[PDB]
Design an enzyme around this catalytic site. Structure first.
Site, PDB file in Angstrom:
ATOM      1  N   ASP A 124       2.351  -8.405  -3.765  1.00  0.00           N
ATOM      2  CA  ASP A 124       1.261  -8.016  -2.897  1.00  0.00           C
ATOM      3  C   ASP A 124       1.471  -6.569  -2.458  1.00  0.00           C
ATOM      4  O   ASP A 124       2.560  -6.218  -2.010  1.00  0.00           O
ATOM      5  CB  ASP A 124       1.261  -8.908  -1.613  1.00  0.00           C
ATOM      6  CG  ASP A 124       0.086  -8.541  -0.726  1.00  0.00           C
ATOM      7  OD1 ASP A 124      -1.105  -8.560  -1.140  1.00  0.00           O
ATOM      8  OD2 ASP A 124       0.328  -8.194   0.463  1.00  0.00           O
ATOM      9  N   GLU A 146      -1.103   0.783   3.830  1.00  0.00           N
ATOM     10  CA  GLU A 146      -1.980   1.121   4.947  1.00  0.00           C
ATOM     11  C   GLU A 146      -1.899   2.615   5.255  1.00  0.00           C
ATOM     12  O   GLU A 146      -0.971   3.092   5.917  1.00  0.00           O
ATOM     13  CB  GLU A 146      -1.528   0.260   6.168  1.00  0.00           C
ATOM     14  CG  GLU A 146      -1.578  -1.240   5.839  1.00  0.00           C
ATOM     15  CD  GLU A 146      -1.382  -2.197   6.983  1.00  0.00           C
ATOM     16  OE1 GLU A 146      -1.307  -1.863   8.177  1.00  0.00           O
ATOM     17  OE2 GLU A 146      -1.316  -3.449   6.719  1.00  0.00           O
ATOM     18  N   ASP A 154       0.506  -3.888   0.226  1.00  0.00           N
ATOM     19  CA  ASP A 154      -0.093  -3.685   1.541  1.00  0.00           C
ATOM     20  C   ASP A 154       0.081  -2.216   1.959  1.00  0.00           C
ATOM     21  O   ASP A 154       0.914  -1.843   2.757  1.00  0.00           O
ATOM     22  CB  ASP A 154       0.557  -4.640   2.537  1.00  0.00           C
ATOM     23  CG  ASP A 154      -0.020  -4.578   3.925  1.00  0.00           C
ATOM     24  OD1 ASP A 154      -0.979  -3.805   4.203  1.00  0.00           O
ATOM     25  OD2 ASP A 154       0.525  -5.304   4.785  1.00  0.00           O
ATOM     26  N   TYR A 200      -9.344  -7.992  10.778  1.00  0.00           N
ATOM     27  CA  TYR A 200      -8.760  -8.149  12.096  1.00  0.00           C
ATOM     28  C   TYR A 200      -8.300  -6.768  12.565  1.00  0.00           C
ATOM     29  O   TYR A 200      -8.403  -5.796  11.783  1.00  0.00           O
ATOM     30  CB  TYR A 200      -7.673  -9.217  12.174  1.00  0.00           C
ATOM     31  CG  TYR A 200      -6.672  -9.207  11.020  1.00  0.00           C
ATOM     32  CD1 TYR A 200      -5.707  -8.201  10.938  1.00  0.00           C
ATOM     33  CD2 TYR A 200      -6.714 -10.176  10.034  1.00  0.00           C
ATOM     34  CE1 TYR A 200      -4.804  -8.178   9.888  1.00  0.00           C
ATOM     35  CE2 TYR A 200      -5.803 -10.163   8.984  1.00  0.00           C
ATOM     36  CZ  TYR A 200      -4.846  -9.153   8.934  1.00  0.00           C
ATOM     37  OH  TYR A 200      -3.958  -9.186   7.883  1.00  0.00           O
TER      38      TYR A 200
END
Ligand SMILES: CC(=O)N[C@@H]1[C@@H](O)[C@H](O[C@@H]2O[C@H](CO)[C@@H](O[C@@H]3O[C@H](CO)[C@@H](O[C@@H]4O[C@H](CO)[C@@H](O)[C@H](O)[C@H]4NC(C)=O)[C@H](O)[C@H]3NC(C)=O)[C@H](O)[C@H]2NC(C)=O)[C@@H](CO)O[C@H]1O
Ligand SMILES: CC(=O)N[C@@H]1[C@@H](O)[C@H](O[C@@H]2O[C@H](CO)[C@@H](O[C@@H]3O[C@H](CO)[C@@H](O[C@@H]4O[C@H](CO)[C@@H](O)[C@H](O)[C@H]4NC(C)=O)[C@H](O)[C@H]3NC(C)=O)[C@H](O)[C@H]2NC(C)=O)[C@@H](CO)O[C@H]1O
Lengths: 538, 538
Positions: free
Chosen positions: A288, A292, A290, A367
């Site tokens: 995965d 950011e 991620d 979120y």
């Protein structure tokens, strides 16, 4: 007459294919992958003829043979498959073979083949669900949650997930490469120790103690080679062979290295280290990403470039190519996923309509839309829709999904995010018509572990009583609690908002739901994720 | 600031002062006595300054110290006293010392200091007695009883004894030295294997597997250094610090070597090997000499010399001198005993009135007076007195005691023997006045383990019912059972005859009672030994 019956000598019976150095803090030295475990067995013959040939059998099959030259003997040989074996020593001569009683030997490997299944009872409010909807039901587990939060792998309600993501696997690098870690005391240093002698841009393990050495249920014996989170995850995979366990690289504070991957020399080094990591830790089922975030606006204010979108698409295509090769080498299916910003300003920096062809799933982080990071513009942090008081609200779940769909992303690739924690403020004031979200705040709400963030468990356990007001906004599809005396306001997901997200996924033919973070739920959120997607109880 | 807190590395924590080679069948190689155990500990520091000095503490006391030069370290040091220690690793610098949590380490020794007390429940009919009479209450335990008889050290009713003797420790020697072993299949060979490379006339262990390696209650872990009978006896000594555990050398089939000890070169070698054996196996409290018998008439018909009595007195005086030296070296009291024939023809071959000055106790073998070895002259095998039908009977307990007293042996040195087994015949016929002992037999009675010998347990369990007659001869003080249809006759001790022996000991001021063999009792015999000598129940 046949030889006498040998007695296996007392000795170590636990061996490993991937050896772990018990006195190493650098990842390069911590694990050693061998093509086979080095095994040894000795024996004594207390009565009889010692025979002329001695053999070591594993489940009846010869693993070693040599001349029998006295009352005692020793054999050293290799075993290339993990598992438990019934090992015997047989002494043979022309008149027959006489085998010892069997002694079990353990041959550890990182697929967890040597471990008993970690099949633990559901805790708190978690209820059993059958993954039969065909939809993703994911959650992240954090490496550092085993300390203060005391949330270990045996506490994950694993039968209620399709995907379990491990946050986070770091990318080696010191000054200028992982400066965002310096914001966390001891954290940057920790990574430099783990990465000592290791090139920058290769993956490592941030906290080797939590990941591999801390005693945990099922992996407490001193000579159990893999303990910590990774030993328990291996045992979890024996219990749930179809659960996808993915290592997640990045997150808020370990994303800086991605910003240098426009240099293919560094990108190739990274991809190769991911391949090696998956060959090393066989319980993992893909990777995965991620990051950011492509374009910046993540933790580091000095990183971000217009070239990031391109770098992201290249990275995914190369990760996929590496996983496709690993897949055919092993006969296994490997997955490639990514957790992405759900804000359209950030989505628009990447051509997901192209990257999707390399990805199994897109974990839309719907979120943290709002929170204590902005004390002036309050709003629902994880709502499906805009609220009636501000129908122009930019950051909503539907808007992020719609941005992806507008690029041409297939709906089935999109996994909607649910929050197992709330964000909030204190001192909220100057609001109209009893809607606290119209005022402004003076600071963050007091969190469970850190300012402005509260575990859902604590919201349900402490902030749904006393002076706290509870309101469910049916337009936005979001709950919120407010304490008028202190002006404390908390926005989060509850069973009902999760049910709305789930119905939305089914209606729009999206891929499923995932959550951050599994330790913070008391069961209500994951139960609703499962029920709302159509999973049958039981 | 003080250094960070180190984490002790996972690793072996079990160490030994007397090492056991797990792949050795020769006694010389099987055990290695060191002056201290080699211990190792490693550590990692996951957070902080590593300090400048690293130390290993045992119960707070430094066992090792060295420069702290990195995030991991290893220390190797020696520990010269057995027991369990709380071991810590402390990292120090000018600002302070920071100690790790403690890890227990085990340092094995042959006094059993590393072991939990083996304090097991009384089995069968054994009832609790307090050794408060001041009288000896002894029994022999046989090394080979752990196989077919399945009688292990955890089954000994140890609180009901003052002395526990282990039969038997063999004296190395091949042809012409231990020929009596050749009568037992594999037995002579077994001793030659144990004694390979070891001089003749030195002691060894006959069955190293039973004595040290077979898993037994309390000593089952693969790395428990001492298992078998010796590991359990060590744990028994932790439970009963005042129980005297003596190694017995000799017995019916291992006595041949004593016949060569008129050669002081051999005698000195033997005595020195006994000293070494006691220095090696610290749980033992002296030595028992079971030479059957000075003068011959033991198992080997070619051994026996008029010089044997002298050799026996010399041997005892030299054993005593060696034990007195060991005693002052250790602060311990060591005992010297001997099991002797109770027949006056054999007693008369030794000057016990002289040897007694070197001995703590004389175990008078007042049993086997009669048996299947003689099919024509039947009689009570362990009676106190002669029977009314033959008041001239030579072999009785009182006659053996009286022979000793007539030489000038002090009464308090004499320990009377009780039988926990019967001897018997089959086909007994041609007897008068219903007294089977007046006939003659056709062969031995069918035994429990061997012809002509029956465990008391089996006498009570099977031969006190059905057609079996039971009679207690009050003149001789002896019970006997007789099966008229087959002519099977068994002579043994029962609670009443043991009570008569006990009263006799108290009346004549003798030393106490001992028995052969502990595995064959169901509790009745040892209970009576204890009660009859005045030991208080409880
Ligand atoms: C001047 C000021 O007021 N500016 C405001 C903007 O900051 C703001 O936009 C929101 O900006 C914050 C950054 O401060 C951002 O919150 C980061 O959000 C990401 C997720 O997108 C989080 O990371 C992932 O999830 C968890 C946490 O939820 C991470 O811990 C984990 O590593 C990641 N992985 C997964 C799978 O969850 C960061 O943790 C978080 N950091 C902080 C400091 O909270 C929001 O994403 C921004 N929202 C949008 C829509 O962009 C803006 C909007 O409210 O308002 C400006 O005024
Ligand atoms: C021609 C024939 O009829 N001759 C008869 C004689 O043999 C006989 O005397 C008795 O002789 C036997 C030998 O055959 C002898 O029994 C040996 O006795 C010793 C004990 O003194 C036993 O050994 C110890 O105890 C156990 C056994 O009870 C041993 O196993 C252990 O090693 C020793 N240690 C302890 C502590 O117990 C032997 O086991 C035993 N061997 C056999 C083969 O049984 C008796 O002692 C002799 N009795 C006397 C009084 O001498 C004679 C007397 O009945 O009759 C002759 O006719």
């Amino acid at each position: 007459a046949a030889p006498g019956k040998p007695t296996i000598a007392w000795g170590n019976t636990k061996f490993a294919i991937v050896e772990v150095d018990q006195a190493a803090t650098a990842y390069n030295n911590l694990v050693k992958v061998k093509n086979a475990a080095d095994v040894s067995v000795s024996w004594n013959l207390w009565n009889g003829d010692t025979g002329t040939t001695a053999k070591v059998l594993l489940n009846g099959k010869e693993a070693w043979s040599g001349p029998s030259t006295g009352s005692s003997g020793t054999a050293n040989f290799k075993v290339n498959k993990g598992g438990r074996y019934q090992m015997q020593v047989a002494l043979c001569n022309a008149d027959g073979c006489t085998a010892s009683d069997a002694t079990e030997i353990v041959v550890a490997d990182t697929d967890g083949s040597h471990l008993a299944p970690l099949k633990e009872p559901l805790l708190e409010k978690n209820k059993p669900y059958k993954q039969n909807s065909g939809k993703v039901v994911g959650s992240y587990f954090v490496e550092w949650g085993v300390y203060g939060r005391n949330f270990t792998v045996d506490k994950i309600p694993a039968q209620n997930l399709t995907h379990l993501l491990y946050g986070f696997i770091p990318i080696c690098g010191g000054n200028g490469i992982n400066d965002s870690l310096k914001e966390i005391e001891g954290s940057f240093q920790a990574l430099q120790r783990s990465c000592q002698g290791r090139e920058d841009f290769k993956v490592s393990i941030h906290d080797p103690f939590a990941a591999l050495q801390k005693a945990q249920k099922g992996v407490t014996a001193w000579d159990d080679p893999y303990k910590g989170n990774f030993g328990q995850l291996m045992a979890l995979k024996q219990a749930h062979p179809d659960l996808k366990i993915l290592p997640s690289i990045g997150g808020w504070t370990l994303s800086d290295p991605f910003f240098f991957m426009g240099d293919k020399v560094k990108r190739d080094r990274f991809v190769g280290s991911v391949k090696e990591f998956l060959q090393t830790w066989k319980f993992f089922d893909g990777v995965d990403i991620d990051w950011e975030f492509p374009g910046g606006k993540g933790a580091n204010p000095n990183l971000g470039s217009p070239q990031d979108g391109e770098t992201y698409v290249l990275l995914m295509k190369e990760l996929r190519a590496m996983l496709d090769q690993l897949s055919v080498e092993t006969g296994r299916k490997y997955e490639l996923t990514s957790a992405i910003s759900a804000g359209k300003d950030k989505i628009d920096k990447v051509a997901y309509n192209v990257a999707q062809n390399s990805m199994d799933h897109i974990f839309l982080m719907s979120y943290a839309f709002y929170g204590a990071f902005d004390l002036k513009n309050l709003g629902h942090q994880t709502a499906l829709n805009a609220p009636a008081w501000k129908p122009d609200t930019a950051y909503t779940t539907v808007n992020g999904v719609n941005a992806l769909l507008a690029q041409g992303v297939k709906p089935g690739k999109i996994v909607v995010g649910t929050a197992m924690y709330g964000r909030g403020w204190t001192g909220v004031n100057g609001y109209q018509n009893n809607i606290p979200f119209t005022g402004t705040a003076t600071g963050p709400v007091k969190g469970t572990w850190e300012n402005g963030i509260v575990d859902y468990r604590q919201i349900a356990g402490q902030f749904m009583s006393g002076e706290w007001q509870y309101t469910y906004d049916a337009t936005a599809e979001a709950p919120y609690v407010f304490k008028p005396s202190t002006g404390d306001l908390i926005t989060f997901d509850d069973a009902r908002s999760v049910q709305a997200k789930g119905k939305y996924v089914l209606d729009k033919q999206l891929g499923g739901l995932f959550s951050w973070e599994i330790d913070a739920d008391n069961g209500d959120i994951l139960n609703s994720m499962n029920a709302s997607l159509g999973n049958s109880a039981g």
